[PDB]
Amino acid sequence: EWTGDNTNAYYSDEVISELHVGQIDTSPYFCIKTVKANGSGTPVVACAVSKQSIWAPSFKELLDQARYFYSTGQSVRIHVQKNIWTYPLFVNTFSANALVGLSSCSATQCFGPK
Amino acid sequence: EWTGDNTNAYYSDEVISELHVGQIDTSPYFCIKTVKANGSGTPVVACAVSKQSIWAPSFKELLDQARYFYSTGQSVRIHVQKNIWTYPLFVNTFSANALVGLSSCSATQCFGPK
Amino acid sequence: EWTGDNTNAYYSDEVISELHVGQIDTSPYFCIKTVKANGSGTPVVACAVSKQSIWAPSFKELLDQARYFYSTGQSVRIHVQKNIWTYPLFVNTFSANALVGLSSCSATQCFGPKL
Amino acid sequence: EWTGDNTNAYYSDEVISELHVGQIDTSPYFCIKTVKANGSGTPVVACAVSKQSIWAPSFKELLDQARYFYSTGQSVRIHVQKNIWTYPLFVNTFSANALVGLSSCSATQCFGPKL
Amino acid sequence: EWTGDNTNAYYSDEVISELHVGQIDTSPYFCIKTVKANGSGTPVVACAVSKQSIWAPSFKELLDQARYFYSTGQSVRIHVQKNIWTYPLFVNTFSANALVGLSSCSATQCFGPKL
Numbered sequence: 001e002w003t004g005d006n007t008n009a010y011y012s013d014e015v016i017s018e019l020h021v022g023q024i025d026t027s028p029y030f031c032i033k034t035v036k037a038n039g040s041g042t043p044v045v046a047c048a049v050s051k052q053s054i055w056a057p058s059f060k061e062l063l064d065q066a067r068y069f070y071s072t073g074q075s076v077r078i079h080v081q082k083n084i085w086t087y088p089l090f091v092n093t094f095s096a097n098a099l100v101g102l103s104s105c106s107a108t109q110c111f112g113p114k
Numbered sequence: 115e116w117t118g119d120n121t122n123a124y125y126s127d128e129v130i131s132e133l134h135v136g137q138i139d140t141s142p143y144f145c146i147k148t149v150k151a152n153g154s155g156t157p158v159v160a161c162a163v164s165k166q167s168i169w170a171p172s173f174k175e176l177l178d179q180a181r182y183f184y185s186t187g188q189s190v191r192i193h194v195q196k197n198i199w200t201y202p203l204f205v206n207t208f209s210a211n212a213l214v215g216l217s218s219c220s221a222t223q224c225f226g227p228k
Numbered sequence: 229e230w231t232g233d234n235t236n237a238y239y240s241d242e243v244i245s246e247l248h249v250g251q252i253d254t255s256p257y258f259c260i261k262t263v264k265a266n267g268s269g270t271p272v273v274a275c276a277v278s279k280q281s282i283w284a285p286s287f288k289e290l291l292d293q294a295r296y297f298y299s300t301g302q303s304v305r306i307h308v309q310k311n312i313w314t315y316p317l318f319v320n321t322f323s324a325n326a327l328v329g330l331s332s333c334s335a336t337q338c339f340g341p342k343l
Numbered sequence: 344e345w346t347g348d349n350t351n352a353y354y355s356d357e358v359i360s361e362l363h364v365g366q367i368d369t370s371p372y373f374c375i376k377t378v379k380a381n382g383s384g385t386p387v388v389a390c391a392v393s394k395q396s397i398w399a400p401s402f403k404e405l406l407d408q409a410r411y412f413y414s415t416g417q418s419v420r421i422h423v424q425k426n427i428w429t430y431p432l433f434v435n436t437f438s439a440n441a442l443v444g445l446s447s448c449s450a451t452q453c454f455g456p457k458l
Numbered sequence: 459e460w461t462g463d464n465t466n467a468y469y470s471d472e473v474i475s476e477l478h479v480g481q482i483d484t485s486p487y488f489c490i491k492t493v494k495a496n497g498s499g500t501p502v503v504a505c506a507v508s509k510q511s512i513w514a515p516s517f518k519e520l521l522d523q524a525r526y527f528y529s530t531g532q533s534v535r536i537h538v539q540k541n542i543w544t545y546p547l548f549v550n551t552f553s554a555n556a557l558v559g560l561s562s563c564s565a566t567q568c569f570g571p572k573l
């Protein structure tokens with residue numbers, strides 16, 4: 001598995017606008033909401049869960065990276081895998097999107113798979 | 115268990131106004147005090163204790179996130195489970211509330227379970 | 229044991245003004261000096277030692293918290309247990325105070341135990 | 344092995360201009376892009392992958408340091424070993440370079456190994 | 459052993475002017491260069507090697523503290539043990555000094571041992 005796999009999805013030129021931390025079923029998790037830097041489109045929501053999904057090993061790295069980009073407000077590309085989380089209330093609160101990567105973006109391009 | 119379980123309680127549009135770090139019964143712990151962003155109402159006090167309670171796995175994540183939100187002074191939703199800590203002197207000084215989640219808040223909504 | 233036990237001591241309206249990190253007898257340790265925000269009184273010195281004393285488990289959390297408060301210069305309450313460290317050259321350089329807690333302070337009170 | 348082995352490669356007076364974090368084959372990894380402070384030449388790309396390659400042990404330290412230099416935008420020397428990552432899509436997106444060290448630089452020299 | 463042992467060496471009123479991180483023999487390491495704040499004298503170079511020497515336990519604490527003081531440019535006392543590292547090219551690039559402590563130095567005397 002890889003962040004950049006074409007079965008994952010990404011959204012470019014987003015700003016991380018919200019951050020949530022919690023626990024579910026013995027596992028720390030976090031979620032972020034992102035919106036286009038230019039005001040267009042719909043918000044993206046994705047979560048990472050420390051002990052769940054193939055993406056579990058990168059939990060701490062993604063959490064720290066999300067916090068950094070959140071604190072700066074800079075434009076980023078968010079990589080997700082759709083339809084992972086399954087607890088209905090959790091999905092309805094956030095989304096079924098697993099967060100699988102974060103890339104910095106300049107004006108015209110982002111540094112990461114596309 | 116989940117941060118968002120309806121048997122937990124939460125308080126929106128709060129600011130983390132104080133932070134304390136200590137140790138109890140072999141465990142580092144931290145407690146926070148939060149107040150309404152607008153200055154109304156009654157302060158909320160919650161603690162997290164390393165290697166104690168079902169919420170233990172999230173101790174470091176919550177500590178890190180509390181320190182961040184404390185340093186920014188931004189509006190947040192605090193999520194707690196009541197009646198967890200039983201050490202009487204500790205409860206008298208702080209409270210029996212376990213901290214179980216933290217969510218950033220815009221002016222219109224908080225990013226988390228409700 | 230608890231930070232807030234009446235057998236510990238505390239000092240309010242202090243500011244962390246120095247920080248030292250080192251190692252002794254295979255254990256990382258750090259020490260801080262605090263002084264009254266208003267310049268009065270006598271400095272307080274306390275150290276935490278990673279593998280020693282009943283307070284060992286909170287070493288990392290207190291080091292990080294000390295670093296934070298040292299960086300902001302904000303007024304805090306420092307909690308110690310007296311007469312813990314015993315190596316004479318160490319005590320004479322620093323003190324025998326074990327660091328057992330740190331609380332943020334407001335104008336009129338601090339957020340932490342007090343008798 | 345060592346960061347400063349002559350079989351490694353280094354690039355001086357670079358600025359870390361982009362940062363990516365992701366996961367591959369069970370391992371979190373990060374990559375950085377660096378560009379000459381003077382605007383010349385071609386960007387250098389290097390990645391570190393947790394628990395992969397002989398450089399695995401230094402993953403966290405390099406991530407932390409890359410984040411630091413990325414945030415300041417100061418000029419550094421980036422040290423890499425070429426031809427380490429072999430996953431073709433990953434290499435195409437980023438490069439085969441393993442990140443093996445970072446050195447700060449003054450205007451006249453960098454603090455790290457050099458031929 | 460202790461940072462403050464009289465068999466160690468220390469240098470007061472220094473600042474951390476450079477920082478390098480890398481790996482050697484499967485161990486993360488970092489080195490710092492310090493110079494007198496006032497510009498007199500000659501630089502001191504010291505390194506900490508994560509898996510190596512009696513000082514190994516303090517590696518993360520020293521690296522974290524080194525980063526902090528490097529970022530602020532504030533005065534410090536650096537404590538070292540001489541003639542520890544032995545890999546020749548490494549020693550020639552950096553030094554044989556192991557970093558064994560860091561003390562803040564705002565006050566009249568630095569906050570740390572000075573035997």
Ligand SMILES: CC(=O)N[C@H]1[C@H]([C@H](O)[C@H](O)CO)O[C@@](O[C@H]2[C@@H](O)[C@@H](CO)O[C@@H](O[C@H]3[C@H](O)[C@@H](O)[C@@H](O)O[C@@H]3CO)[C@@H]2O)(C(=O)O)C[C@@H]1O
Nearest residue numbers: 466467468469470471494498499500535566567568572573
């Ligand atoms: C390994 C070693 O010798 N360490 C000693 C150091 C070094 O010799 C010195 O740092 C290298 O230049 O010197 C130490 O003592 C110095 C210290 O007490 C400082 C004040 O913190 O004073 C220095 O003398 C200065 C003094 O500040 C003024 O009189 C100035 O005008 O000149 C003199 C000498 O130039 C001391 O050398 C140290 O702590 O750095 C003691 C170490 O053991």
Ligand SMILES: CC(=O)N[C@H]1[C@H]([C@H](O)[C@H](O)CO)O[C@@](O[C@@H]2[C@@H](O)[C@H](O)O[C@H](CO)[C@@H]2O)(C(=O)O)C[C@@H]1O
Nearest residue numbers: 237238239240241264269270305336337338342343
């Ligand atoms: C070990 C001890 O007695 N600690 C006292 C502390 C010290 O006596 C004092 O800080 C020495 O400088 O004093 C404490 O109470 C303080 C009052 O004495 C002071 O007049 O006002 C302070 C306002 O916060 C404070 O209330 C303290 O520092 O909290 C009490 C403590 O036990």
Ligand SMILES: CC(=O)N[C@H]1[C@H]([C@H](O)[C@H](O)CO)O[C@@](O)(C(=O)O)C[C@@H]1O
Nearest residue numbers: 122123124125126127150155156191228
């Ligand atoms: C235990 C409890 O009462 N929770 C409720 C709180 C509190 O009444 C006030 O927030 C007190 O600050 O009010 C809410 O509107 C909120 O803050 O989001 C809904 C929430 O369910």
Ligand SMILES: CC(=O)N[C@H]1[C@H]([C@H](O)[C@H](O)CO)O[C@@](O)(C(=O)O)C[C@@H]1O
Nearest residue numbers: 352353354355356379383384385420458
């Ligand atoms: C692989 C390689 O040749 N690295 C060399 C680089 C590059 O040629 C240029 O940096 C490319 O832009 O140049 C140096 O002067 C430098 O940066 O310190 C010496 C270094 O050995």
